[PDB]
Amino acid sequence: PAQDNSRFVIRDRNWHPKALTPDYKTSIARSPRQALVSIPQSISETTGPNFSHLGFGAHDHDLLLNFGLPIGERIIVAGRVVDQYGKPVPNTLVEMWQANAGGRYRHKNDRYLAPLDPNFGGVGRCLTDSDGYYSFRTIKPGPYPWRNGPNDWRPAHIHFGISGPSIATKLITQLYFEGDPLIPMCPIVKSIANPEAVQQLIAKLDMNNANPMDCLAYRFDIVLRGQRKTHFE
Amino acid sequence: PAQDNSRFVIRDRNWHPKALTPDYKTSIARSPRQALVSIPQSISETTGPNFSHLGFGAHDHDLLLNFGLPIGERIIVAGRVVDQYGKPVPNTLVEMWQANAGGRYRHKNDRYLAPLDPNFGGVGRCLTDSDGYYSFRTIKPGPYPWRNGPNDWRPAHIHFGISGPSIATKLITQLYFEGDPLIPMCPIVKSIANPEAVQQLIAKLDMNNANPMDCLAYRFDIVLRGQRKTHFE
Amino acid sequence: PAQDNSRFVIRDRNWHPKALTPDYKTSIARSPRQALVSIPQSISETTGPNFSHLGFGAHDHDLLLNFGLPIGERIIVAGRVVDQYGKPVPNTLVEMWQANAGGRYRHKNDRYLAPLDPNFGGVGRCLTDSDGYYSFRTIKPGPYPWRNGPNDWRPAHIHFGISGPSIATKLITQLYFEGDPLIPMCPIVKSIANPEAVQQLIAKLDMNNANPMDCLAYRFDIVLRGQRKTHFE
Amino acid sequence: PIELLPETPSQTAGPYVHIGLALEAAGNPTRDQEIWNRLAKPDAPGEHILLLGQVYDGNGHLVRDSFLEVWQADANGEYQDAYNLENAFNSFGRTATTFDAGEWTLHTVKPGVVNNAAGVPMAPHINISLFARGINIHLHTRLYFDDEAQANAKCPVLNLIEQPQRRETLIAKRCEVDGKTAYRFDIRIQGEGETVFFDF
Amino acid sequence: PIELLPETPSQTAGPYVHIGLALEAAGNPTRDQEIWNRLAKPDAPGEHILLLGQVYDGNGHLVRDSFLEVWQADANGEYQDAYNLENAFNSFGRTATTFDAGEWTLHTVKPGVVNNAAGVPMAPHINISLFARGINIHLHTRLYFDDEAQANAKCPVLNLIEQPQRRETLIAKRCEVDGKTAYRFDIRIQGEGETVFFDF
Amino acid sequence: PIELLPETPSQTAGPYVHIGLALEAAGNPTRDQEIWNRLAKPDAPGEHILLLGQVYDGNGHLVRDSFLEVWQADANGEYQDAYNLENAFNSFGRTATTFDAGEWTLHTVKPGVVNNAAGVPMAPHINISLFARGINIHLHTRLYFDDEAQANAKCPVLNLIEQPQRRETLIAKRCEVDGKTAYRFDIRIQGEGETVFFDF
Amino acid sequence: PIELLPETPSQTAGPYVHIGLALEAAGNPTRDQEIWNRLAKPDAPGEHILLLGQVYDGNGHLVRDSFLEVWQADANGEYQDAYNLENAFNSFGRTATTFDAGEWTLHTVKPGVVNNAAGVPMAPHINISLFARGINIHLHTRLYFDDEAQANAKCPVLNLIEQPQRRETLIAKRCEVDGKTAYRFDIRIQGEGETVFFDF
Numbered sequence A, B, C: 001p002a003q004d005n006s007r008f009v010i011r012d013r014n015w016h017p018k019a020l021t022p023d024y025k026t027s028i029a030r031s032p033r034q035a036l037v038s039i040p041q042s043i044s045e046t047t048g049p050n051f052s053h054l055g056f057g058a059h060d061h062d063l064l065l066n067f068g069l070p071i072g073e074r075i076i077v078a079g080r081v082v083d084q085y086g087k088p089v090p091n092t093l094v095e096m097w098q099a100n101a102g103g104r105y106r107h108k109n110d111r112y113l114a115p116l117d118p119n120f121g122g123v124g125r126c127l128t129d130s131d132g133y134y135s136f137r138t139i140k141p142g143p144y145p146w147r148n149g150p151n152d153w154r155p156a157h158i159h160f161g162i163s164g165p166s167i168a169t170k171l172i173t174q175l176y177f178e179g180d181p182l183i184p185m186c187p188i189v190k191s192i193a194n195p196e197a198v199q200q201l202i203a204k205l206d207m208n209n210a211n212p213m214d215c216l217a218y219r220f221d222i223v224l225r226g227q228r229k230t231h232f233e
Numbered sequence D, E, F, G: 001p002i003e004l005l006p007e008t009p010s011q012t013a014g015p016y017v018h019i020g021l022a023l024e025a026a027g028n029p030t031r032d033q034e035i036w037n038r039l040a041k042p043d044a045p046g047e048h049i050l051l052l053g054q055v056y057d058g059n060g061h062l063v064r065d066s067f068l069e070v071w072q073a074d075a076n077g078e079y080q081d082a083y084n085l086e087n088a089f090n091s092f093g094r095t096a097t098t099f100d101a102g103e104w105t106l107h108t109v110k111p112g113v114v115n116n117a118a119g120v121p122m123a124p125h126i127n128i129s130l131f132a133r134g135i136n137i138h139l140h141t142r143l144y145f146d147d148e149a150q151a152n153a154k155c156p157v158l159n160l161i162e163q164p165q166r167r168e169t170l171i172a173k174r175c176e177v178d179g180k181t182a183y184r185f186d187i188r189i190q191g192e193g194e195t196v197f198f199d200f
């Protein structure tokens, strides 16, 4: 089984969004009022699942064929997963989900008037390679109106889930697209207090990775908590 | 019939794109080498057609219904048409055309692999009102790869044609969307030498005109040549 | 009756003071803990009363005559009411109330030791003209001590109530006087987080509107939510 | 993106709001024409009702310096915007709570049904705006009637409130005062049973 | 000096101009009313003629994606600005070159004479604006008729062209197409025999 | 001081998390292999139990869009990191609350004991991470069992919780569901009886 | 967007390029092993051909200081990248024009067919890079054979050239020199009949 060999860099709870961020209404009632209780790292926290043996389908990472071709801006989303130290995270699970080109999600609860795309599902997954690289192929999602303020619109975004080496590193986040005028207006985005942190969530147009006359590409690198060896414990 | 009452502000051929702009390959062979011959304004040049009596269809200006609902980002494109003096241009013809959400045009010659949208045509037209205001409803087009340099992509854009009061004011242009990272890279855009002029072609996100939980809006005002009365001629 | 022909720009709740501003002690127990529920605008929200036929007395807007001459600095408070689009708001109701020269209100509950002024009531009302102009004649109010912190003093102010075209535009605010050193120290003023918003509440000395050898004048413009026609609803 | 002129920021009505908006209450002489708590003249069509309630702070203490404004449709579901003391019915009204008992009252008629922008009918309701010392920006709410249950269940507005328990906070409880139909509508600004406030 | 608001900059029409301005050509369904290549109805006064031509680039190759707009006076030398499909004659029209042959056609009537600002008569002419992919800003030109030699010689506009040889490029050649009077007007955008283009 | 690269910031999972992490729930077709709520196969060593619970917000209302991830040792107190559907037992699992009842379920085996870094044994426990719309960063918690009182009393982790009353919030209550041993573990995100959440 | 390191900018080869790349031609002693104009040893499989041509400037004047590099597949349509003077066939070669006559020559075999990225076969061709004084960045072209007409018509590369007349500029004209199969391929850098140059 797994073993307690590692220690992870303590999270900076001032970098990440706070629990209570009133402009984002739902956080009011879904945020604790008591302080988190700090605990030392043990095997329980320093280990996590390895998805190396999960049976991945041929098009698990290709939203263009995993669900006719979808209507929308063909894009490749690629990048690398490293830790705070710059060390790559090989064979890690990356999962993503998004709405269609119009901003409609293939989910029961979504009642937005934009139509579903008969050829689009919105889910992808893949394992990072030895160098910590991942890549997906999809269509650029559209902005989505939501019940927050009377005229709130989510910028185009893709939901991301990354495992990392431990449950301590597991992260759920969102990717935004470079230059989207909606970004600076979003209360969800704004849950993050440091503008430098916000910059970390914007994927940059990547012409070097684009497929001429085919599809464009976006670069999105993800940084997981630094992993160090224990010492003098 | 029409009459020679007006004079129009001379065009600034240094503001507009030049004829020969080599990065845009097609201009090499399609640009004159001899200088334009300047001529004084006469009735021939100072008059133009009036489209007040043209039979406009009910959805001429609604690309969402003028062709099932199209897949893509529902947007309203509105703005006003004024002259150099700030004077509105009422009852003028505005025409626009674009590709679909994926970047595919409903044109014979377009062979891009993105699919056509069964519910989208791509053409709109309308007359400006007494205040010089126009408005259209469509979907935000996608970027389009084209045979220029080996990896050239047109930023998302809508083609515009505006009549104005004379043949002297008639203009054909293109609208770009605020924050599009592709803009500064386009050779067509770059045909325009003054960055201040480029700014005139970018439509700005307009939250005040958006329809909550429905569609977003973009503002695009157009300025036509100033019209003055003749004096001491 | 009234008709649902308008939509009003969504309010900017980050511009306006937030509900909970602890330095203003009373807001602590008088501010909701649950998030506001946004609703679409309907006829209920886009209509409001018209005070065109309200029977205004002759000196309704003249605090010098409507209650001997009051003691204090004689001034005229005038300005214009426009919406966010800069459009005038004609025939709208403006009501104002304030303390006397010494900071004493003519109210049961005011136990401040500064005496009442036998010739002053402190209430005015009037209707904006075709151009959205309003004007009052009064005396400059005095600062007032209040039980907030142990030594809090309200800057000299005038309470204002404006109806506008619908209940969506109705607003209650306060006018402050240019250069008053108490402004920046006041907890009620500071409930407004943007210093730029604070500036909108300061009435500027208006020498051009002053009556020589008689009274000074202050200019205070008011901006109500922008009104626009519905489109593609 | 595009930017318009910013709206003039709100400020609290203050404790002495009465001097300007509820003359009588300030204990000051009124003017010839005042906007008050009687929307309907006894001879107005519809079902005459008396409305009353208290306003509580987060400590459950009465708010005795509160000021309210109301807007409703007539018995036919029409909004009478031309305000006139002559009319038998006015859509707009004003009330305030007693410095003593801390209760407000309103004399009107039960509003008829109006449709929303989509054409769906809303349950009969009264639009209320609450102002007071300690309230930086006024609070918007709606008053619905407990005896219009069938309608309430289908109101598109009421339905926007996620939690059903929160919907109940907008329902006035029918009763009778002096043999007259009364509806009690208490407002809890903060805490346990906090009333739903709206943004539009 | 004084500065006005700057005119919105021009941009090429692009290769797909047809989807928007010449529906038929795009191979798309047309609308009830379309502005096309037939300025005159059979019953229009004046001499009915057919105009046709080709567009050449700098290498002598055909420009098959060109879009043209025309503005001309009627037989009486009067500009008919009220555009209407009911009209027997419209002063305005549109045409485009075929993707195959690369030839445009226009059905109209020979324009009558009009005077310039100084009151001098200009030889019969058609005002042309050419648009296409590779053209950043449209090109202005005039179509004159070879059988109006006397008039052409005296035209104040034609006479502004410094070199007599360059004037020749603006003269359409009389011919017959299906036994119908026609005038051929070829446009050479760049190079040898390059058509005079105007700025006004 | 020294600075590393900054960790990518967290963002809420959103209400549609299910499309991506719980396909079935989204009501979408699943893939061949999915990470779900069944950590143990009938033939797995250890005491088979059923875990179930509800999630409450600050107002006492159910959170019906919550997503949970669990990490636990096997019956022998060993973390089985090699995730594989062939395994008789997997240390990792996923579950979500029903849009209706708002209840999550997990089929597993009671975890054996594991020691902390200092070599001290920790009472049997399940590590939980909770995600949902309104949660900017996931919440960490531990599920302990009420029948492990002796162990619980001595747990170095539980003992870090300053107030004994707060420790009680981490203890699942033994029950029976269809005559099967079960433990109920309700999560109160905010307010009265608010569950202890950890930072590590 | 993302930015990589910029590539080192090109500079003209200059008039004395020969000293470094065409030793003999500089009139300098060669080294043991030189990269030259003989791709095929007489005993190499395929059809042996002799290639020759001139290079003209925009004035139609010969460019006598030009330097060329070639890359082709063997007779089987395979690229032999391991360069060795021993091999009977090398895919890479170098040539230059005479300071006198101004003609270049190459001794090779006719290349076999290769497929493009899409799997469509390209007509037999030789990839050429041209360097010289006055050439800031080298020019890329392809040499096709006049006797492979059927193939040429279907080449996906040749087909990318819009104007058919421009395609002809890449076709070498077969002949015979000393009873040996020869193909003449003239390069016109600028002007009338300018050869198609590529970007990749």
Ligand SMILES: O=C(O)c1ccc(O)[n+]([O-])c1
Pocket: C026, C144, C146, C154, D012, D013, D014, D015, D133, D134
């Ligand atoms: O407590 C308050 O809110 C207050 C007290 C005095 C005053 O003059 N104003 O405006 C407000």
Ligand SMILES: O=C(O)c1ccc(O)[n+]([O-])c1
Pocket: B026, B144, B146, B154, B188, E012, E013, E014, E015, E133, E134
């Ligand atoms: O070649 C051109 O000029 C071109 C190609 C594509 C496109 O969309 N626009 O606008 C222009």
Ligand SMILES: O=C(O)c1ccc(O)[n+]([O-])c1
Pocket: A026, A144, A146, A154, A188, F012, F013, F014, F015, F133, F134
């Ligand atoms: O309410 C939310 O938290 C929410 C709503 C829509 C959306 O797309 N995302 O990501 C989040």
Ligand SMILES: O=C(O)c1ccc(O)[n+]([O-])c1
Pocket: G012, G013, G014, G015, G133, G134
């Ligand atoms: O004409 C030339 O291009 C030239 C002349 C001399 C030299 O040294 N280099 O490098 C180049």
Ligand SMILES: [C-]#N
Pocket: D013, D014, D015, D016, D017
């Ligand atoms: C002031 N009240």
Ligand SMILES: [C-]#N
Pocket: E013, E014, E015, E016, E017
């Ligand atoms: C672009 N046509």
Ligand SMILES: [C-]#N
Pocket: F013, F014, F015, F016, F017
């Ligand atoms: C978002 N779900």
Ligand SMILES: [C-]#N
Pocket: G013, G014, G015, G016, G017
């Ligand atoms: C140096 N040539």
Ligand SMILES: [Fe+3]
Pocket: C154, C157, C159, D014, D016
């Ligand atoms: Fe006050």
Ligand SMILES: [Fe+3]
Pocket: B154, B157, B159, E014, E016
């Ligand atoms: Fe285009």
Ligand SMILES: [Fe+3]
Pocket: A154, A157, A159, F014, F016
């Ligand atoms: Fe989302």
Ligand SMILES: [Fe+3]
Pocket: G014, G016
């Ligand atoms: Fe040199």
